[PDB]
């Protein structure tokens, strides 16, 4: 229920923010429509989530940036989205609490295939005939 407070120090703080936009855009509202509150409930978050994506709104003392990451991504998909305000239904929450395609094993589907240092050596091995 913390979220206005945590997000807001960062939202008005600086660092590097390109890719931040993309990830916050699909993300901020999600899960249960009104289950938070510190001085901004889940709805303030959807407001915020939309501003950060590409809109404008006073919420979390404004977001750091609004202008999205790499050219294709844009705000718009998610802006349309949040049909049911940050709630597990057919919104961001759905997407967030679901995993894109099959995700199992160490076949590299949300995986990385053993221990990262051993893998560098295995990748190196071209196995040229």
């Amino acid at each position: 229920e913390d979220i206005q407070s945590v997000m807001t120090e960062v939202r008005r703080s600086l660092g590097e923010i390109p890719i931040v936009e993309s990830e916050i855009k699909k993300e901020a509202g999600e899960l249960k429509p009104e289950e938070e509150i510190t001085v901004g409930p889940v709805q303030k978050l959807v407001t915020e989530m939309g501003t950060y994506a590409t809109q404008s709104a006073l919420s979390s003392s404004r977001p750091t940036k609004k202008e999205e990451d790499r050219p294709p991504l844009r705000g718009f998909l998610l802006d349309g989205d949040f049909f049911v305000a940050a709630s597990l239904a057919t919104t961001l929450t759905k997407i967030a609490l679901r995993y894109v395609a099959l995700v199992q094993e160490k076949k590299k589907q949300n995986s990385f295939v053993a221990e990262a240092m051993l893998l560098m050596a295995t990748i190196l091995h071209l196995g040229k005939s």
């Binding site: 890719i19 699909k26 990451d69 790499r70 294709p72 998909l77 894109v100």
Partner: protein
């Protein structure tokens, strides 16, 4: 070399009894060394060292005095109770010898603040007049610093400053004129007097010329009262002294903004002045140039060309070569671009590293800036992509793509596709992002998307997160825009690459789920072409220029509407007649940035006139409140109401209005004069923009009269056939009067006078009348306030003067009477 702590500390002995000029001077040298070598003083020890040194001023030795001046300025800000040192500096300053004189004024004045300003003045006046450059110049620079603390003390010095100005000694003059311009300024005109006095003179001071050129560069024709020319007889427009910098500065301003026009011994419109200096050594750099020039940089460009072009090609020296590119760039233009582009192509061969990136950017950048076609720009942008392959960047993907979608897009994607064949993962995140973004957005039917997809698919595996995330989202948009595409999206997204990495996964889970699962109302909506994330300007070209040689919206379109908007906010004006029109001849009552700027417009309504007075109090000593512009009509008009300007502070516009009712039976015109006086309450102000005193006095400022013309009442129109309209409006309000226009000897002028005055456009283009014809019929039409047409017929007889019988008809008695009266 040194330790700041030890030296700052041992300085404290001065504060007690020991003064030892040798030891202390050394310790001081050490302080200057700590700064110079690059160190930062500690504040406690600094503060202590500063109070200690002041004792050392007792002993008058020229080296110790010198140490003391540099050390107190450096330690001044990181020290306390510094005020004690003023006396000691004055004592030193009056002591005769340049070692004390010049260096003290400078140290003293730096520490000196408005309280202390008064003290230094006698000694300052004595030091400024010196033709001994050290004392005078130090005193002149010192005065510049002092303008901050207190302006007024410095201003008194204008006479001593001027006295130095008359020297031809380079320093004394440079400093004197430069400083003066800053000091005496209270208005443009007083500075301008200072400049004209020196202006006629052929100096041997290049610095004075330069500092002055800058003051001069704009046209000044009020120098020492007035004069008939922007004239500068000191090189700015003249070329009395040759010396390549002064010559360059002067020549670029004068050519297309005369400081004076061309003289046989001083070109100043012609391109020449730069060019005669142009073949030279290292010196050439100023000389060879251009900027502006008559009428273009291009006839100019040819002279100089041998110099700029040979150095630029030959020298793979950075220092020469840079001067040569800047010089090429300067002799450049729209025309020059053919030449400029080959040279810039050539240039990278001399210095090729960043300079390589810059030339491939420059050739594109120049093509965008100076048109050799937008296509060619894209083709150059391909060459940039080819050569560097990585010094393109992220800002390039956005700029190339935005620029490209003006024309190039189908080609650009395709080119990009080929370009992508380069290098699988060293090509960078950015190129992959460009082919990806463009292939996504265009949705190639110009080439088969399958090559593009195959190229991008490999790049993603081994390149950064941002592109792999880019690739999934693009694919999704690519799906929504083109149905065909969906099968490729599925093979790509299931892969561990375009989804299921990290960032790439999150975006993908969203983008995928929206395409796969959901309606694609969202997906459809989202693609509007599949455009970039932001549309900036065209960033590259300016960047490139320096780097190489190292919604206004509107409502109104008519005066009546804009005024009508201003009026509409206030109720009374629309409630008491609605606005037919507002004047096509608004008259400014009082001139801009004098005492007041008042512009008044007379607005006509159905039965009323409202006068809007835009009032500015440009009174520096006052701020105004409850300001109104009062009115006395010279005919029968009732003044119903005044609407005040709430406040008019210094330099802030406000509007006040007077509503009056129009007569609707008047036998003489609605062309009428109102005497205007603004009355207001003054509260004292310190000039800034506004600030009011606790109490004040009533004051009035007189204004010019406002004249209302028949033109304000009528809006002009012509008719296809006057005769019908002319009868149709009302021959029942018909009145006829005969006039003689004796000051107008032909019909054409005569028609113009009735048309302007009345505010009626003569029908059928009847302002052009057969020259010197015996009879003519002049057809006038326009609509009068209230919205009723007014037609006027003037049957012109030409003798040697014009006589006319003017018959007017209108839907009212008033327009007829009004026109007839106004004309004569």
């Amino acid at each position: 070399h040194l330790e700041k702590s030890a030296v700052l500390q041992e300085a404290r002995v001065f504060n007690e009894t020991p003064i030892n000029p040798r030891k202390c001077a050394h310790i001081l040298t050490k302080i200057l060394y700590l700064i110079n070598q690059g160190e930062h003083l500690g504040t406690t020890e600094a503060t202590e060292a500063f109070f200690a040194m002041t004792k050392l001023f007792q002993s008058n030795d020229p080296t110790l005095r010198r140490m003391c001046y540099l050390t107190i300025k450096e330690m001044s800000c990181i020290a306390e109770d510094v005020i004690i040192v003023t006396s000691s500096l004055t004592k030193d300053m009056t002591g005769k010898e340049d070692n004390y004189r010049g260096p003290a004024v400078r140290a003293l004045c730096q520490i000196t603040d408005s309280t202390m300003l008064q003290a230094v003045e006698r000694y300052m006046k004595q030091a400024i007049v010196d033709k001994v450059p050290s004392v005078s110049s130090s005193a002149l620079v010192s005065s510049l610093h002092l303008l901050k603390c207190s302006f007024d003390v410095v201003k008194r010095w204008v006479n001593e400053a001027q006295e130095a100005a008359s020297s031809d000694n380079i320093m004394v003059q440079y400093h004197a004129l430069g400083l003066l311009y800053h000091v005496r300024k209270n208005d443009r005109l007083a500075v301008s007097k200072m400049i004209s006095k020196f202006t006629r003179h052929g100096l041997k001071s290049p610095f004075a010329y330069c500092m002055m050129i800058r003051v001069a560069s704009k046209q000044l024709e009020e120098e020492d009262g007035s004069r008939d020319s922007p004239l500068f007889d000191f090189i700015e427009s003249c070329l009395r002294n040759k010396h390549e910098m002064v010559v360059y500065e002067a020549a670029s301003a004068i050519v297309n903004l005369p400081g004076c026009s061309a003289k046989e011994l001083a070109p100043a419109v012609s391109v020449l002045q730069l060019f005669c200096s142009s073949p030279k050594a290292a010196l050439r750099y100023a000389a060879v140039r251009t900027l502006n020039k008559v009428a273009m940089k291009h006839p100019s460009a040819v002279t100089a060309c041998n110099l700029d072009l040979e150095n630029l090609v030959t020298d793979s020296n950075r220092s020469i070569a840079t001067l040569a590119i800047t010089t090429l760039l300067k002799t450049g233009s729209e025309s020059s671009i053919d030449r400029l582009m080959k040279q810039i192509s050539s240039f990278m061969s001399e210095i090729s590293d960043e300079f390589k990136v810059v030339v491939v950017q420059a050739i594109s950048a120049l093509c965008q800036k100076y048109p050799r076609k937008h296509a060619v720009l894209m083709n150059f942008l391909f060459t940039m992509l080819r050569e560097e392959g990585g010094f393109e960047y992220k800002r390039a993907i956005v700029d190339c793509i935005i620029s490209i979608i003006e024309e190039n897009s189908e080609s650009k994607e395709t080119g990009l596709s080929h370009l992508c064949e380069f290098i699988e993962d060293c090509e960078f995140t950015v190129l992959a992002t460009r082919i990806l973004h463009l292939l996504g957005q265009e949705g190639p039917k110009t080439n088969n998307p399958s090559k593009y997809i195959r190229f991008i698919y490999n790049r993603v595996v081994l390149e950064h997160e941002e592109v792999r995330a880019g690739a999934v989202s693009a694919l999704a948009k690519f799906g929504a825009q083109n149905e065909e595409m969906l099968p490729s999206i599925l093979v790509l997204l299931k892969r561990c690459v375009m989804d299921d990495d990290n960032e790439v996964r999150d975006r993908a889970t969203f983008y995928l789920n929206v395409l796969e699962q959901k309606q694609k109302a969202l997906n459809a909506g989202y693609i509007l072409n599949g455009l970039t994330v932001s549309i900036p300007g065209l960033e590259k070209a300016l960047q490139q220029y320096t780097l190489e040689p190292s919604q206004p919206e509107k409502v109104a379109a008519t005066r009546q509407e804009i005024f009508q908007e201003q009026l509409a906010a206030v109720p009374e004006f629309q409630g008491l007649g609605p606005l037919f029109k507002s004047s096509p001849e608004p008259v400014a009552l009082t001139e801009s940035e004098t005492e007041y700027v008042i512009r008044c417009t007379k607005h006509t309504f159905s039965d009323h006139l409202v006068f809007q007075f835009d009032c500015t109090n440009t009174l520096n000593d006052q701020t105004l409140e409850n300001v109104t512009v009062q009115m006395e009509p010279t005919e029968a008009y009732e003044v119903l109401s005044y609407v005040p300007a709430r406040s008019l502070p210094y330099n802030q516009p406000g509007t006040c209005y007077t509503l009056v009712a129009l007569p609707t039976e008047d036998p003489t015109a609605v062309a009428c004069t109102f005497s205007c006086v603004m009355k207001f309450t003054v509260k004292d102000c310190d000039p800034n923009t506004g600030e009011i005193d606790e109490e004040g006095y009533e004051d009035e400022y007189v204004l010019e009269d406002l004249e209302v013309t028949v033109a304000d009442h009528i809006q002009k129109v012509m008719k296809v056939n006057f005769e019908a309209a002319w009868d149709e409006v009302g021959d029942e309000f018909e009145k006829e009067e005969t006039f003689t226009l004796s000051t107008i000897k032909t019909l054409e002028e005569a028609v113009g006078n009735i048309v302007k005055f009345l505010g009626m456009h003569p029908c059928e283009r009847s302002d052009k009348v057969p020259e010197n014809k015996n009879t003519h019929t002049l057809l006038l039409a326009g609509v009068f306030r209230g919205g009723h047409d007014i037609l006027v017929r003037s049957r012109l007889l030409l003798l040697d003067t014009v006589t006319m019988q003017v018959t007017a008809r209108s839907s009212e008695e008033l327009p007829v009477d009004i026109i007839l009266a106004s004309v004569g």
